[PDB]
Subunit: 353 residues, 3 copies
């Protein structure tokens, strides 16, 4: 299944006692079917309570989502140093090239953040540039000769070897109880918002780039779905956007029709927590949750401007909107004999499975 | 010829006794020379009179042009079905994912439509998503299992196996004379001024507007994305040229537009100057090709191109010009040609001849754009 | 070195005994590393005094910079014709497909022009279309049959062969005192701008697309850096722009921290090369780069910075050092050292952007 990514497709770039960062492989590596989203990479960051994430700037425009816990994200722009207080559900865009560090405020629960990066310059490949540490993460300063650093900073050579040539703990280190306290057009909370879809079978929260200028620069919509146990997300497809969905918590399963994979096309997966599945534009996809627990899934909708969700099944079903004569010629069956199939349901988007 | 595509370069994705849909191959497959229009695909739909095209949606932005016959195009859009009655020379913009169906409201004239597609995901590749059908066409509901479809629309399993197992004639099926009359009775859309321009959404009457270039030897109708809501999203200009028999569209080149020309009706030939391939700069290679109905030739930006019509009958070419904003159409011969505007002393040094030998070369054609052949 | 291009990477498309045009190869030819500037090409034009450059148009957007000499650029866009006299440090935008010829109106100085081209059709490739020429500047009219040219131009076949076959001297030809006749929005004199950064150790001129419209179409900033002898342009990185630097005059060297050529889990390869007149080096987005001038003479660098909108010059040393802005707590856990010890190494440089460096 080219449209499904489990744990074996990730690659840990950061691994410490107090934290880890997993980076998903390029979507154009396995198959060319995902020729789009080639300039998009997916990253997952988790950290222990009262820990510190070393500062670094990226070769990519960064948009992240706070999956669990609370945190303090500090961005360093031109002169101005912005610090923002975020919570579970907040969305922040980090502009490419700016330095950013963050901590885990909370005392007992962890901290999970889902990053999506659009590489500038070379597409599909991004790197983190570390300005601190000489062994644990080498400072790019160490890539310069000593004469250049001595001349630029006007500092003794042995003092440079001392400041950089220390720190071997992690790009995610632990913090003192006091240092966490001192550090604690802005962030956008997706959960604390009027749901675009509201019913007992599911709660859908989405932030479209027309509403918030933070997401307009990348033309990317972030949407979150809380599925009721046993319920399902009815079969539908996006007009123009390609859905990159990541499971935050829970189990279920999804199915999708792909005319590219057939013999002139059954595509499905089990869908557990920590699995990424890509739903391209125009592909009919349906998500069903197990009867035991919920299915909280985060979706990234690339190319969101002009998108229009078409439900294959529901109140606004795209088929029962046809003319009475067109339904007859299509199925080669009388009108009322096929008019009843799409008129039976009354719910919206979310259904029970 | 790297710029000429004939019948062997088309794929018949739809094959029915009442019509066919030939889809052109990707411009990259043969060579990387046409890499500028890699994310574009071509299609040609033919249909017998009084027929029905099954509803479907595409993973690509679609802009179709009616090159022969009349039809009724209906789109469902966002909770508001709209239908349009279009005839010869109408441009229709179908948003990506928007389902669409159409008929051939004529009694004896077959349909003939040219489609240009712009994929929104994987570049250069697209597929049609038929929602209704069993075998031909195949509905994507059959990819979902019976257990999921059961709890989707409150319908039993054995009741679904009867609906999705009936249609098998094809995507272009015959229709009774009243079903054609029902759809073609009323067109659904907000009031618009006529002829339909680009100030509001809906079809565009390309042949109902004054030509940008017009004389005895030919006429050129065009729709630029700058003043067209339907085309501005694509930065694609649609042009049509009715070259008189024995006449020619004189040598010219686009400043930044890449022309994807499709011959609708007539016979002729075209010549183009290409420095990119030239057998290693030995000399310009005379890229000539015979032109008939069904031949598609592409002229990349900056390339001088001339289209000559046969002496027998006119040559009528449909032009898809990608990257149209800021595009200037520079003529190399005739009235207002570009080489004439050079300073006199610059022509003496460029050609290495005195002014008496070169000046009246670009000053001795009273006509503009269209000339005798 | 994937980021450095010597004279062996250029290909001369024009070569006459009065001038030549060396065209840099594709940035994506050797490796897929410089994919961010795949749709950009570089070219250098040198011309003897009192010479003429044959007219032509390109299937590419053209932004040229005059590095040395006097000249005048003549363009013929929509019907009307414009002719601008340009000198040292002028920026001229040329729309794709608009013909352009020029001359070196100086009587002694050679005309040196640095071109950057953005192909408007097939990415990474372009060609020059000569209309008024003969054999060596081969006119594209020769690609059409004489029956077509005769009907469209209304000119006899014998005269067409006589005109489109005479010229064989090349694209750059000497012109004898007809210069005065061929020289009698708009250019941007970069050197006549106030430097964005200026001290004793260097001056930085720049023309951002947000302030000039002409560049706004390419999202391309043109920058110049006159670094004093022995001095250096301190380690910095562009937030978004990919810099394509060309050494106009002088000697020196540059260093860059590239984590893509690391060949390790999370390292930074040391990219370095000597700088001399004609060397082109590319500093991708986010890459810390430092340029150092030779101790004898100055080092003058012209920079084409693709993707300039929203770009910021983050300096890693000097007055506006980015690391100094960090909070004292953040400085400690990052270095695993006391906050008081790490501050001394980033506050010890008083100068901005330009510093000395001799060892
Ligand atoms: Cu597919
Ligand atoms: Cu060519
Ligand atoms: Cu690198």
């Amino acid at each position: 299944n080219p449209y499904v990514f489990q744990d074996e497709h990730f690659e840990s770039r950061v691994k410490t006692e107090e934290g880890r960062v997993q980076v998903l492989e390029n979507f154009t590596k396995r198959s060319r079917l995902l020729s789009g989203i080639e300039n998009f990479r997916l990253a997952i960051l988790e950290a222990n309570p009262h820990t510190f994430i070393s500062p670094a700037h990226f070769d990519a425009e960064l948009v992240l989502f706070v999956a669990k816990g609370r945190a303090t994200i500090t961005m360093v722009r031109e002169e101005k140093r912005e610090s923002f207080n975020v919570e579970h559900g907040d969305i922040i865009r980090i502009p490419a090239g700016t330095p950013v560090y963050m901590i885990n405020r909370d005392e007992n629960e962890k901290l999970f953040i889902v990053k999506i990066l659009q590489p500038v310059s070379a597409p599909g490949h991004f790197e983190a540039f570390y300005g601190a540490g000489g062994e644990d993460p080498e400072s790019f300063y160490r890539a310069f000769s000593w004469e250049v650093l001595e001349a630029a900073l006007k500092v003794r050579r042995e003092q440079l070897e001392k400041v950089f040539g220390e720190q071997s703990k992690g790009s995610i280190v632990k913090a003192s109880r006091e240092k966490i306290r001192a550090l604690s057009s802005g962030p956008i909370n997706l959960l604390h918002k009027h749901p675009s879809q509201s019913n007992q079978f599911g709660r859908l929260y989405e932030a479209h780039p027309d509403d918030h200028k933070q997401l307009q620069d990348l033309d990317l919509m972030v949407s979150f779905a809380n599925i009721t146990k046993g319920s399902m997300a009815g079969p539908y497809y996006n007009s123009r956007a390609t859905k990159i969905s990541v499971v935050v918590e829970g189990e279920g399963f999804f199915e999708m029709a792909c005319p590219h994979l057939s013999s002139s096309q059954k595509i499905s997966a089990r869908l557990r927590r920590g699995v990424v599945f890509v739903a391209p534009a125009g592909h009919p996809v349906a998500v069903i949750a197990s009867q035991n627990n919920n299915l909280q899934v985060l979706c990234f909708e690339v190319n969101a401007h002009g998108n229009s969700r078409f439900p294959l099944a529901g109140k606004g079903n795209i088929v029962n909107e046809f003319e009475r004569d067109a339904k007859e010629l299509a199925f080669n069956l009388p009108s009322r004999e096929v008019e009843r199939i799409f008129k039976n349901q009354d719910q919206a988007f979310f259904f029970p499975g």
